C-alpha cells in the first residue's frame, strides 16, 4: 500500500504461506511457523541461522502440510529424495 507522497501507508504488513500463497490471518489460530536449524560441516546447528517455512491453517485442515513441507525442503536443499513431482 502506497500513496502519491511515497510514504508508507497502512500497518500490519502480512505474510503468506510458503506452500500456497494465501495470506495468513491475524485471527487465524491453526497455523504455525516451521523453522529448521543449519549445521556447518560439524553436525552442530549454528543458533540464529534457521530457515523459516510459513504454513497456513487451511493446508493443515486438508492434511497436506507434510507433503508441502517435504516439497519445500527438497526444493531448498534441506532434503534430497523423498518428494517426487511424478508421484
Amino acid at each position: 500500500m502506497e500513496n502519491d507522497k511515497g510514504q508508507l501507508v497502512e500497518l500490519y504488513v502480512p505474510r503468506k504461506c510458503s506452500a500456497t500463497n494465501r495470506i495468513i490471518k491475524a485471527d487465524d489460530h491453526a497455523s504455525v511457523q516451521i523453522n529448521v536449524a543449519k549445521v556447518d560441516e560439524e553436525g552442530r546447528a549454528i543458533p540464529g541461522e534457521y530457515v523459516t517455512y510459513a504454513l497456513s491453517g487451511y493446508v493443515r485442515s486438508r492434511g497436506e502440510s507434510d507433503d508441502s513441507l517435504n516439497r519445500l525442503a527438497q526444493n531448498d536443499g534441506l532434503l534430497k529424495n523423498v518428494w517426487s513431482y511424478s508421484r
Binding site: 489460530h29 491453526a30 497455523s31 504455525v32 511457523q33 516451521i34 504454513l55 491453517g57 493443515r60 485442515s61 492434511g63 502440510s65 507434510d66 513441507l69
Partner: peptide, 23 residues
Amino acid sequence: SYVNIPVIALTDLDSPSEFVDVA
C-alpha cells in the same frame, strides 16, 4: 492447533494425516 504449536507425529499407514507438519 488451538495454541499454534507445530506438530511432529509418529504417523502410520492407517493413522490419520490431519494437522501434521512433520510425519
